[PDB]
Amino acid sequence: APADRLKALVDAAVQPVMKANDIPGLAVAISLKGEPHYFSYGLASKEDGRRVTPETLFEIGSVSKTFTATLAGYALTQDKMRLDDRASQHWPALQGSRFDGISLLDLATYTAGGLPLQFPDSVQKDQAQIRDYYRQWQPTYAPGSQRLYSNPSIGLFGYLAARSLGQPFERLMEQQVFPALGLEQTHLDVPEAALAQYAQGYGKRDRPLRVGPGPLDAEGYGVKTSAADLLRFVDANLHPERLDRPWAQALDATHRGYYKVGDMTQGLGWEAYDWPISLKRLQAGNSTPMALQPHRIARLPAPQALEGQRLLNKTGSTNGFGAYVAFVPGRDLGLVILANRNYPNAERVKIAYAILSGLE
Numbered sequence: 110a111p112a113d114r115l116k117a118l119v120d121a122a123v124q125p126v127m128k129a130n131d132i133p134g135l136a137v138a139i140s141l142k143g144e145p146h147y148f149s150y151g152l153a154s155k156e157d158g159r160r161v162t163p164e165t166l167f168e169i170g171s172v173s174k175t176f177t178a179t180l181a182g183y184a185l186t187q188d189k190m191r192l193d194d195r196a197s198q199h200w201p202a203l204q205g206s207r208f209d210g211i212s213l214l215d216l217a218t219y220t221a222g223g224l225p226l227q228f229p230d231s232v233q234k235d236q237a238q239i240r241d242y243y244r245q246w247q248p249t250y251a252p253g254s255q256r257l258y259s260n261p262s263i264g265l266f267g268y269l270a271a272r273s274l275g276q277p278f279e280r281l282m283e284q285q286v287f288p289a290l291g292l293e294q295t296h297l298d299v300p301e302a303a304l305a306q307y308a309q310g311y312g313k314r315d316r317p318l319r320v321g322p323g324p325l326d327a328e329g330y331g332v333k334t335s336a337a338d339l340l341r342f343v344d345a346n347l348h349p350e351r352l353d354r355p356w357a358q359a360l361d362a363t364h365r366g367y368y369k370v371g372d373m374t375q376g377l378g379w380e381a382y383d384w385p386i387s388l389k390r391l392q393a394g395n396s397t398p399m400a401l402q403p404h405r406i407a408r409l410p411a412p413q414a415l416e417g418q419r420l421l422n423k424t425g426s427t428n429g430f431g432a433y434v435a436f437v438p439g440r441d442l443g444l445v446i447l448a449n450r451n452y453p454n455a456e457r458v459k460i461a462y463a464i465l466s467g468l469e
């Protein structure tokens with residue numbers, strides 16, 4: 110039976126990696142030939158024995174940036190902002206700062222000139238502290254030259270896109286973005302009535318870990334969603350034309366590459382690779398040096414359509430969770446892997462590659 114073969118393929122990819130990385134619970138969702146398939150493993154909470162299901166909520170960390178990118182795509186389609194706008198055009202407090210010479214594109218693609226991975230610990234989740242942080246910041250190098258993966262960078266991009274729409278970022282995601290995408294199990298602030306679905310996260314010595322408040326957390330890493338909802342988001346990405354036009358264009362804006370770093374082409378949120386490509390190369394593109402070190406970019410002469418024979422992906426983590434999303438536009442194939450342990454990106458890619466290969 111084809112169901113037996115598919116279960117065998119996914120189990121063979123997942124089971125050893127869960128055991129090796131001591132993952133308590135893991136949800137897989139696959140979109141194949143326009144049909145969804147779910148595979149759920151282990152426990153959402155070890156303490157109460159709640160099992161993972163396709164409706165369990167996981168923290169997706171940096172995968173949130175693809176949602177942030179979608180909201181910015183919507184602001185672009187509505188002509189409320191342009192990627193070449195100066196960042197300070199959208200926030201008067203930034204006028205006269207170094208943000209007068211940094212574009213929204215630089216912010217979105219981590220090339221603003223050395224904005225750090227995280228806000229310093231001295232910056233709390235407070236509007237005035239965030240404002241003052243950006244007003245005083247000075248680039249280490251020229252904007253548009255080096256990519257340094259950064260939550261304050263794309264966080265500001267999302268914050269400015271929301272300002273361009275005249276509403277708070279979190280309100281726009283809840284009231285407009287998630288409903289437009291048909292996402293009813295996707296949250297920035299999990300409702301009390303949905304808490305029973307929120308998985309526990311696990312760190313060292315199995316300490317419980319759920320993400321706490323931080324500056325621009327919603328924009329950079331704040332989404333909690335189920336494997337079923339994240340697959341719905343992947344399916345919207347595979348077929349933007351099925352949504353109402355403004356939202357179709359918003360999703361299309363996240364499928365455009367601006368530059369290359371090694372085998373990776375950088376879009377808004379999504380990162381793309383030629384497909385097929387070796388597992389080692391895909392792991393190297395999602396490796397620690399890509400997250401922690403600056404890289405000189407190879408700018409494209411024109412934005413490149415991220416479609417056809419390409420794999421678009423995003424890793425995301427929080428202290429207690431590890432997520433991975435990947436899809437092949439030219440093959441109508443999509444995958445979501447959500448876990449309640451922050452396990453190495455290389456291991457997430459290893460599961461995904463075994464599944465994607467087996468399906469091919």
Ligand SMILES: *C(=O)N1C[C@H](NOS(=O)(=O)O)CC[C@H]1C(N)=O
Nearest residue numbers: 170171172330400424425426427
């Ligand atoms: C996203 O989840 N984050 C940003 C950073 N690198 O992202 S990647 O490895 O998920 O692409 C470090 C991990 C994480 C964070 N802690 O903010």
